[PDB]
Design a binder for this molecule. Structure first.
Ligand SMILES: [Cl-]
Ligand SMILES: [Zn+2]
Ligand SMILES: [Zn+2]
Ligand SMILES: [Zn+2]
Lengths: 315, 317
């Protein structure tokens, strides 16, 4: 009456669950969306050659949901489906080594993912979700399909959409161990006094308004509550890097003064990101393309700087 | 022959300047606008003393001010906003059935029905520029709101636009964080698959005008070659927008909030707005028509919502 084979199911490829499957029913009828080595097998019926194989499935019971939470650090039931949807594309991208870093050859507007991937290889950062940490290690080795698809899933973006580097880094930093990061700022306004503020976590390493770390330390002009202009400056910084962002204009990059940067060109609604890194000179990594130059000048949107512990000497 | 003026990129932070009447504004400030009019090649007049001029965000401080007000980093935004505003300030914005409309001009019908729709659904804008201008538009002064819509949509005055595209751009600048949509796709061969949409995708659907049809199920292809049934499982939003290629459709009073009618084709056409009050009202720019029934080439229908959960059992499909 009923013929069967034994297979394994998983949501993390670490915990394997024995399943006896009915060979007269499809995998989708029995498990829902089912993948065998990234290949969609939802519509097909079990075959004798499938016996003993491991199948990815979505978390549709309590055991699988706990494992998904522990591996991906998410409770969104749609997360693994969106990751698999993205992976179907990113598994076809090429991930060349460029200047010793894993880049991504351009496809489907993935330029923002390349400069994000390149940036992460240059700043000291640990990822909390085991899925992210594992996929980052594979990406550093040149096999970044899983990492890229995770990024898309964590940001709730799909292949082809315009990505923003600042927004993307912000999502990823929420899943990094940045709790020990600290920033202390002071704002000063004639006729209003002084006031200080302490930031922690992601907010302690990201700033929007100037690309220059030294300018942030010397003071930036900001509108006050009264309506006149005031001066905000960085008092103390505890973090392994800082990210400085600004609306793009024409910014000059010089060797040895920064770690890496991102540039935005083309049509503003559907444009193009490049990566600039400081090595023994400046390299512009443009997906698979590489140029070298003494200096660089353009519509820079984000600059990353190394840091450890900073304390101001101004009063 | 020198006067004081204010320059700004947001009309919030005003920067005092001294100008000389012997040179143009452009030689002193770069590109300069007075109520949207390009005054770059104009010399300061006595009557300009103390007035507020827009300039381009030409330094780090101004680019911050512009970003915090408009939520854009596009360097062309201000000039495009001002170019549109020079025109929209001359449009007329009559009250039609308690709502701010727009008298027809410059193919602005798509903006009129978008504006009429926004006044009937629960929506908050995130950019202060949009918030402030929307409050003025509700009160009848819609020139700045209409020029912002054009600038955010990268449309110029006179171009025929698209309500669905326009709403997409505006919803991306709205607070939709609490909006969630869960769908189920059921195939006789493949089984079930649920999906969760957030943000603009949680409130916009393209394929059917009827919210009730979206609840009972629409037929879609399945990669196995058969037809699958797609239906709404769960909806958390204060409204929903259902769109479909324009086709003859009967709008029944009391079954919807408002809708967009489009006569024409891909190159040229005209929008009208239909709203369901104690009866059906067709708002066509400044023109109002009342009817017990309405039938037309409908392309977008808006419905009120709060929390919906399906009663379909998948095994009963
Ligand atoms: Cl019109
Ligand atoms: Zn003050
Ligand atoms: Zn199927
Ligand atoms: Zn028209």
């Amino acid at each position: 009456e009923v013929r069967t084979i034994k297979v394994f199911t998983t949501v993390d490829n670490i915990n394997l669950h024995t399943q006896v499957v009915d060979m007269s029913m499809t995998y989708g009828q029995q498990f829902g969306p089912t993948y065998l080595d990234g290949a969609d097998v939802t519509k097909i019926k079990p075959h004798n050659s499938h016996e003993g194989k491991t199948f990815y499935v979505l978390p549709n019971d309590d055991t699988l949901r706990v494992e998904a939470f522990e591996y991906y650090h998410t409770t969104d039931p749609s997360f693994l489906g969106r990751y698999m949807s993205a992976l179907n594309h990113t598994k076809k991208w090429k991930y060349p080594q460029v200047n010793g870093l894993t880049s991504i050859k351009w496809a489907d507007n993935n330029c923002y993912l390349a400069t994000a991937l390149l940036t992460l290889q240059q700043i000291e950062l640990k990822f909390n979700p085991p899925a992210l940490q594992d996929a980052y290690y594979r990406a550093r080795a040149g096999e970044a399909a899983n990492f890229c698809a995770l990024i898309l899933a964590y940001c709730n973006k799909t292949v082809g959409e315009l990505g923003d580097v600042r927004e993307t880094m912000s999502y990823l930093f929420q899943h990094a161990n940045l709790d020990s990061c600290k920033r202390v700022l002071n704002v000063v306004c004639k006729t209003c006094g002084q006031q200080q503020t302490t930031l922690k976590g992601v907010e302690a390493v990201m700033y929007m308004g100037t690309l220059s770390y030294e300018q942030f330390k010397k003071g930036v002009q900001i509108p006050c509550t009264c309506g006149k202009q005031a001066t905000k400056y960085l008092v103390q910084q505890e973090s392994p890097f800082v990210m400085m962002s600004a609306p793009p204009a024409q910014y000059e990059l010089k060797h040895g003064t920064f770690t890496c940067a991102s540039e935005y060109t083309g049509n503003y609604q559907c444009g193009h990101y490049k990566h600039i890194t400081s090595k023994e000179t400046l390299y512009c990594i443009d997906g698979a393309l590489l140029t070298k130059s003494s200096e660089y000048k353009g519509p820079i949107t984000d600059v990353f700087y190394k840091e450890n512990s900073y304390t101001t000497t101004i009063k």
